[PDB]
Structure 1
Amino acid sequence: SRKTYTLTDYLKNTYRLKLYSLRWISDHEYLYKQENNILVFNAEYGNSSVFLENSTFDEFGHSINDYSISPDGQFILLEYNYVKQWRHSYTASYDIYDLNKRQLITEERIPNNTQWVTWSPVGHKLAYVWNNDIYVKIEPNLPSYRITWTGKEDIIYNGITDWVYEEEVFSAYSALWWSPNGTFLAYAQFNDTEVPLIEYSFYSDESLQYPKTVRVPYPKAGAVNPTVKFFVVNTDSLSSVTNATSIQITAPASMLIGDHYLCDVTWATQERISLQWLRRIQNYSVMDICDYDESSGRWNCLVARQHIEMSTTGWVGRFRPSEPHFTLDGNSFYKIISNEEGYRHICYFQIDKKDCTFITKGTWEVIGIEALTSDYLYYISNEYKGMPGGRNLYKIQLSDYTKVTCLSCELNPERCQYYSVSFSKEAKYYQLRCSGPGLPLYTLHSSVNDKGLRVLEDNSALDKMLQNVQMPSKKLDFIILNETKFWYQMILPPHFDKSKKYPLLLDVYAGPCSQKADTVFRLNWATYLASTENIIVASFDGRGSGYQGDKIMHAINRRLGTFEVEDQIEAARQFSKMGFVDNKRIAIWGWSYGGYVTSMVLGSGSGVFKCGIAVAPVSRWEYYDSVYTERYMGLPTPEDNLDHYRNSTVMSRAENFKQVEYLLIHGTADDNVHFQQSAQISKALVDVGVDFQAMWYTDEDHGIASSTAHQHIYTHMSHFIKQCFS
């Protein structure tokens, strides 16, 4: 029949997925941007009006890469001169457009090279970070109030995170949190003074005669970590003559005794904020609930109002302690914590009572709490059909935990088994986002009866294009290893014949709490391999995997590079025995943690794999950052876990690579998994006399995502796999 999904289709994105990204501005309306203008929609009836015409900025004279409308609907923040930094961080120039007077504000404009900017939750106040210091604008056209004066490049960070906090704890560059009505602005300050610097060359454009050396405060495992302080300022009590006063919230003592981290900040009410702290040994965390003292001006966090969250089997939380969701009065809150059986469920706390009450239970987990009304609590879980890789929205009656209703399970069970949700301001409405196994489907619903209002986007256009192409199919199932079931997925070539023996590629990540076997619909490299090259692309979730309880997830505690790699080998072993797999052509590849596992597997001497590809792999844990590495490995000291740190390197397995074909790939400007990691792998291979293939990508970082580098790497990897299988 017709054509197949080719590499060019993947690299040129010939088959595009349609989305419906909306932004709720109230409990009844949302903004829906288009290639040109922004419309405002009425959720109840579906009618719309133009919020702001596309031409409006025809002669702005700058390429605008993003807008941000004040909660007010009164102003629009125009972002341009975007310059990316790390995974989330970047700098840019900003201009504010007054939607009232339809005029661009030209006075007291936000400075260029601004690091972060954000409106207050309600009015139109602005808070931004420039040169590592925090500034606040009460009105768009008025002078800014400086909040901090200690900002110093690569040393003191006010309102923004340093490298490790951005990548590993807040997943954001922002380190400031406005109170509910905008009165208070809370923020964190990081000090990297004694944090060592990772240094690497950046070659830049051909015209640069001498390469530049990039240096960034980056704490590797066991190194000196940055320290943190927390402050809260009243933005209603600032002059312009007085240097605003930031009230610091310190402790707790159980944390100050040694190295620790600030891992969460969540406002409870107008005058109550909650903070979660984590010891460097991420076995123990403490939440403080602090109240603003009217006549004192300071903040007090009553003990007895603090809650301890610890683990005896591993670290706390999936990647960090979960965030609390406070009831309206801020006197109680709900939060996801691990069960006595090791399953993460919603517990209900009274702010001044130590024991909480689990409101959900079972051998499945709550992925996240999505909304809270005085009536119900909405959450996503993988309870349905007992499929860990499925996601559905549920609502539980606060008055009777016995009454739990699934809101998405039955909408279209064939096409939709993986959902995410987006509620309006007061949860009056919600958009459901189906991402698989069928084509993504976006719909709108009203919470009063959970009635489906209408279909927002059904990807019918893409559906029409795909019926003329031989697409692969996807199989989601499980195998059983000593009592326990472990899930896997396989992207199967079109016209799959179980009597035929296909070459198999094991797509791996396998990091702690990861999930590579799910019901999500994807159009990627694997789609091409299966559709055009007739390769089966499988993924397996073994020990260390997430969303299935702690017995499985914590199985690799203090032992990275053991069970999770062994299980990938075992999975391949079972696959090669299902009947439709050519055991002479089994390969493996992964990126980052997956590059590490791929390398550990290729050097295991198992002999199960013929070839493999490792992209930006970790090679030895002492080279990776402290927050992530130590969370699972503890400290690289003789008193703690040094022996296993030394036993789990890729380099020690070099000799075993004589039995496989290896392709090692790494971006030279990788600020995350340093090129150093692959540099040591190659040196060990050379020292043992093992031949292999390699490819460096000049000035590319961890994503090797530039348009040209992206196309080049996948093209290179395609040739390698085909050669290995042909």
Structure 2
Amino acid sequence: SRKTYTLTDYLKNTYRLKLYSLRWISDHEYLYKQENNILVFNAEYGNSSVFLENSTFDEFGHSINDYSISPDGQFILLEYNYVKQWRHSYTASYDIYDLNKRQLITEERIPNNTQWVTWSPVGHKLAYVWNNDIYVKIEPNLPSYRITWTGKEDIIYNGITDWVYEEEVFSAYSALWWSPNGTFLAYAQFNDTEVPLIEYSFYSDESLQYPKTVRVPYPKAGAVNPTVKFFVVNTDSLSSVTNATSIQITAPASMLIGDHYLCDVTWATQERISLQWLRRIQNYSVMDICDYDESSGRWNCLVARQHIEMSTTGWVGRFRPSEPHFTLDGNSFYKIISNEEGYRHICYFQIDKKDCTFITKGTWEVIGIEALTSDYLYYISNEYKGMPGGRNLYKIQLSDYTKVTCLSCELNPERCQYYSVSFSKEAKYYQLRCSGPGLPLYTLHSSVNDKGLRVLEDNSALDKMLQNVQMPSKKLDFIILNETKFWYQMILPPHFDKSKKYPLLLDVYAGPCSQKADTVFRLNWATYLASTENIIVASFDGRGSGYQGDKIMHAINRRLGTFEVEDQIEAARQFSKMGFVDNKRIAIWGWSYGGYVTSMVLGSGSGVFKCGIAVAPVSRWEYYDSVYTERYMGLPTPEDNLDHYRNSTVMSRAENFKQVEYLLIHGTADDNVHFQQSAQISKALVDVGVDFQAMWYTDEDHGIASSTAHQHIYTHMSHFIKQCFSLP
């Protein structure tokens, strides 16, 4: 087809994937921006009209980064000076603009360096956090009220997560939760006083004479943890004479016993909150149901409503206990639970009652609960064709659990085996969103008989661009190990001719619950080694991997660095026993858990691998954070699990590295996996005499995501691999 997918094509992004990011603002309408204007859409008719032009803000006087219109649609929130902190957090400066009156707001603007902002889910209220303090703002142009005063950088946090609860718990900077009404504001505060500090240099620009020190409250395995504290503030009751009386909802008795975390918050009604907690040993967690006492202004959580959730095989829930979905009336809910067979399914809960009732079952898992009406429960699963790296949207009949309809399976069977969805308020309508193995598809459906209204986006354009490239093909299959099935994928060179030996790259991640074999269509680096450098990119999901039941996802319990590494290798073993793989030219590269497994699989001394690259890898588990690690390893003490904290370090395999060509890489500014992890790696290698290649990336953090550094690293990983596989 003449040209190939070019390395600069991945880098400079010459083939762009169209999406369809819309925004419901009622049960039948959504926002979507065509070119640069904001159009609103009727979902049952497709008709649209312009809500705001592209040219409205041409004299704003600030680069606009992101907007946020309010529910009543009477005000838009504009984000500028966006400055990035960790994986999700940041400060930003904001402005509010009135679209009834046609002008910007000047009375009491949101303060600069604001950490989080959000609208109430109704009308136009405001809450936000500045210097670790929560402020509400009934009206956009009246004085905001001050909800907490404990705020204190790096120590006290109000309505925003400290660092572990950002990364490991909520995957979010925010610790704020509105009442569907808007009436109540629920929020957490964590105390990082006694949390130890991780320290490193940030070199900044050349002008900077002396390098800076970044210090971060970050608890490593075993260390003192942040505590937490939960409150709920009545917002239709504030006032500027008095200050605000948050009510504190105290954790359950079986948690107050030793360290624990808040792990879920899910409002249930205008007057009833649902929270979970999880002991610092994370095989045990408690759900609590709390209602507003109209007459006292208090909240109560009766033990009758308390619900336990245990694991004797490992930890609880995939990366944490599932979110509950409640019925309109709040007296009952649905939530994914590992069943008797260890497979994760939708169990049904009546608030007052013992047990729960399962309603799904089988050798396959439900992925998430997606929506709930009075007839049907909508959810995503991988049942179809025993295909665990696949996703379809399904419905259950509330009155007859037996009637289960697949909603996405047959829409586009050849293009589309991997969906996510987005429902409108009340679940009147929905967007199905398709990511492969063909190009993306965004289509609109109506939940009444599940009619097929409209095609939003179909990537038409991308399509015919790609026809003009020697794109690679993809292979989803399985191999049997004991007599268990483990799937894998391969990216295969154009005109794959299975009678030629093709050099082979093993791209791993392979941490608890991960899945690198699937049907998603990606354009990345793998796509370029393949179509341009005729190399096979193989990926594989072994023990410890996800979405195929707890025997497989819990095999690695307490034994990180064991079977997950083991399997990876036998898989390569099987891959080279194939006729199109050149057994003299097998490699492995991974990033994060990836680069640690890689490093492990590389000092294994198996003989299978010739070389690999390790980007930003863990190295010794005591060096990583408590929340994530301790979920899996327990505690690094002799009377617990120091035995295999010590058994599983990249470092202790220095002597097997002489059999391979190691290329290790890390960013100086990585707050996630600290340079340390790698530095200890190199010291060991130097200390037992092994030769190897290295690259620091100054100021780059965990993803090495700065355009030039991004470019620079793929450029470097690429020359290494070409030279490893005697490539021209």
Aligned counterparts of 2:467 and 2:142: Cα–Cα separation in 1: 57
Counterpart secondary structure, 1:652: helix
User: How far apart are residue 412 of structure 1 and its match?
Assistant: 0.7
Alpha-carbon deviations, 1:37-95, whole Å to 9, x = none? 10011111111111101111101000010000001111100110100000000000111
Once the two structures are superposed, residues 155-196 of structure 1 have per-residue CA deviations (whole angstroms, 9 ceiling, x without a partner) of 000000000000000000000100111000000001000000
User: Which one is further off, 497-506 or 553-562?
Assistant: 497-506
Distance in 2, matches of 1:597 and 1:403, equals 43
Aligned to 2:458: 458
Secondary structure of 2:115's counterpart equals strand
Deviations 1:311-335 (A, max 9, x none): 0000001000001000010000000
- Measured after TM superposition, the shift of residue 241 of structure 1 is 1.6
Distance across 2 between alignment mates of 1:484 and 1:340: 19
1:414-473: CA deviations, max 9, x gaps?
000000001111111100000000000110000001111011111110110111111100
List per-residue Cα deviations over 1:218-269 (Å, max 9, x = no partner).
0000000000000000011111121100100112111010000000001110
The aligned counterpart of 1:59 is 59
Counterpart-to-counterpart distance in 2, 1:579 and 1:314: 40
Per-residue deviation, residues 323-357 of structure 1 (Å, max 9, x unmatched): 10000100000000101000000000001112100
- Matches of residues 133-152 of structure 1 in structure 2 within 5 Å? 133-152=133-152
Distance 1:692 1:315 in 2: 37
What SS does the corresponding residue of 1:478 show, helix, strand or coil?
strand
SS of the equivalent of 1:402 reads strand
Distance of 2:266 and 2:656 partners within structure 1: 50
Q: CA deviation at 1:525?
A: 0.1
Q: Could you say which residue in structure 2 is the equivalent of 1:494?
A: 494
1:687 is aligned to 2:696: no
Query: Structure 2 CA distance, aligned partners of 1:401 and 1:350?
Result: 16
Deviations for 1:284-308, whole angstroms, at most 9, x for unmatched residues? 0000000111111111000010100
Name the SS of the counterpart of 1:340 in structure 2: coil
Segment drifting more, 157-166 vs 41-50: 41-50
Q: Which residue of 2 aligns with 1:371?
A: 371
Which residue of 1 is the match for residue 245 of structure 2? 245
Secondary structure of the 1:639 match is coil
Aligned-pair distance for 1:108? 1.1
State the match for 1:437 in structure 2: 437
In structure 1, distance between residues paired with 2:248 and 2:462? 54
Q: Which moved more, 1:232-241 or 1:707-716?
A: 232-241
How large is the RMSD of aligned CA atoms in angstroms? 0.6
User: Following the alignment from structure 1 to structure 2, what is the Cα–Cα distance between the partners of residues 446 and 294?
Assistant: 39
Distance, in Å, in 1 between the alignment partners of 2:511 and 2:421 is 26
Question: C-alpha displacement at 1:6, in angstroms?
Answer: 1.0
- Distance, in Å, in 2 between the alignment partners of 1:208 and 1:630 is 39
Task: Provide closer, same or farther for how the CA distance between residues 343 and 675 of structure 1 changes in structure 2, counting only shifts above 3 A.
Answer: same
Between the aligned partners of 2:580 and 2:612, the Cα distance in structure 1 is 20
Q: Secondary structure at the match of 1:413?
A: coil
Aligned to 1:590: 590
Q: Say which SS state the counterpart of residue 672 (structure 1) adopts.
A: coil
1:689 to partner: Cα distance? 0.6
> Are residues 1:402 and 2:402 paired?
yes
Q: CA deviation at 1:103?
A: 1.4
CA distance in 2, matches of 1:192, 1:549: 36
Cα-to-partner distance string for 1:17-47 (whole Å, 9 max, x where unaligned): 1111101111111000134110011111111
Q: How does 1:54-453 map to 2 (within 5 A)?
A: 54-453=54-453
Q: How big is the shift at 1:5?
A: 0.4
Comparing 508-517 and 102-111, the one that deviates more: 102-111
Distance 2:635 2:352 in 1: 34
3-state secondary structure, aligned to 2:385: helix
Tell me, in whole angstroms, the C-alpha distance in 2 between the residues paired with 1:505 and 1:657: 18
SS at match of 1:552: helix
Partners of 1:375 and 1:515 in 2: how far apart?
33
Q: Name the CA distance, whole Å, in 1 between partners of 2:355 and 2:107.
A: 54
Say which SS state the counterpart of residue 255 (structure 2) adopts: helix
Give SS of 1:337's match: strand
Identity %: 100
Q: How far does the alpha carbon of each residue in 1:124-182 deviate from its partner, in whole angstroms, 9 at most, with x for none?
A: 10000000000000010010110000000000000000000000000000001001110
Deviation at 1:596, TM superposition (A): 0.3
How far is 1:214 from its partner? 0.2
Question: 1: distance between equivalents of 2:218 and 2:59?
Answer: 42
Distance 1:39 1:671 in 2: 40
- Output the CA distance in 1 between the equivalents of 2:416 and 2:660: 40
Aligned equivalents of 2:26, 2:2: Cα separation in 1: 48
Between the aligned partners of 2:660 and 2:108, the Cα distance in structure 1 is 63
2:28 is aligned to 28
Q: Distance in 1 between matches of 2:187 and 2:588?
A: 44
Between the aligned partners of 1:614 and 1:279, the Cα distance in structure 2 is: 34
Partner Cα distance (2:214, 2:613) in 1: 28
Q: Distance in 1 between matches of 2:227 and 2:142?
A: 34
Cα shift at 1:271: 0.6
Quote how far apart the aligned CAs of 1:407 are.
0.5
SS at match of 1:514: coil
Distance in 1 between residues matched to 2:538 and 2:231, nearest whole Å:
48
Q: Secondary structure at the match of 2:370?
A: strand
Distance 2:181 2:206 in 1: 51
Q: How far apart, CA to CA, are the structure 2 residues paired with 1:679 and 1:35?
A: 47
Instruction: Please state how far the C-alpha of 1:523 moved relative to its aligned partner.
Output: 0.3
Does 152-161 or 35-44 show the bigger shift? 35-44
CA distance in 1 between counterparts of 2:103 and 2:82 reads: 23
In 1, Cα distance between the equivalents of 2:42 and 2:237?
Answer: 38
Which whole-Å CA distance do the structure 1 matches of 2:705 and 2:251 have between them?
Answer: 41
Supply the distance in 1 between the matched residues of 2:400 and 2:454 (Cα, whole angstroms).
30
Partner SS, residue 403 of structure 1: strand
Give the superposition deviation at 1:660: 0.2
Distance 1:500 1:640 in 2: 51
In structure 1, C-alpha distance between the alignment counterparts of 2:161 and 2:337, rounded to whole Å:
26
Deviation of residue 557 (structure 1)? 0.2
CA distance in 1, matches of 2:455, 2:37: 21
How many angstroms does 1:607 deviate by?
1.2
CA distance in 2, matches of 1:227, 1:173: 17
- Unaligned 5+ segments in structure 2 are none
- Work out the CA distance in 2 between the residues paired with 1:72 and 1:86: 32
Aligned-partner Cα distance in 2 for 1:416–1:55:
38
Which residue of structure 1 lines up, in the alignment, with residue 669 of structure 2? Answer: 669
Q: Secondary structure at the match of 1:241?
A: coil
Partner of 2:529 in structure 1?
Answer: 529
* 1:639, distance to aligned residue in structure 2 (A): 1.1
Distance across 2 between alignment mates of 1:459 and 1:119: 33
Q: Give the unaligned 5+ runs of structure 1.
A: none
SS in 2 for 1:452: strand
Matched residue SS, 1:106: coil
**Residue 17 of structure 2: SS of its match in structure 1?**
coil
TM-score normalized with structure 2 length: 0.99
Q: Distance in 2 between matches of 1:72 and 1:698?
A: 46
CA-to-partner distance for each residue in 1:571-617, whole Å, 9 max, x for gaps?
Answer: 00001112111111000000000000000000001111000000000
Q: Distance in 1 between matches of 2:693 and 2:644?
A: 29
Detail structure 1 runs of 4+ shifted over 4 Å in the superposition: none
**Cα deviations by residue, 1:469-520 (Å, 9 ceiling, x for unpaired):** 1110000000001120000000000111111111100000001000000000
Q: Secondary structure at the match of 1:219?
A: coil
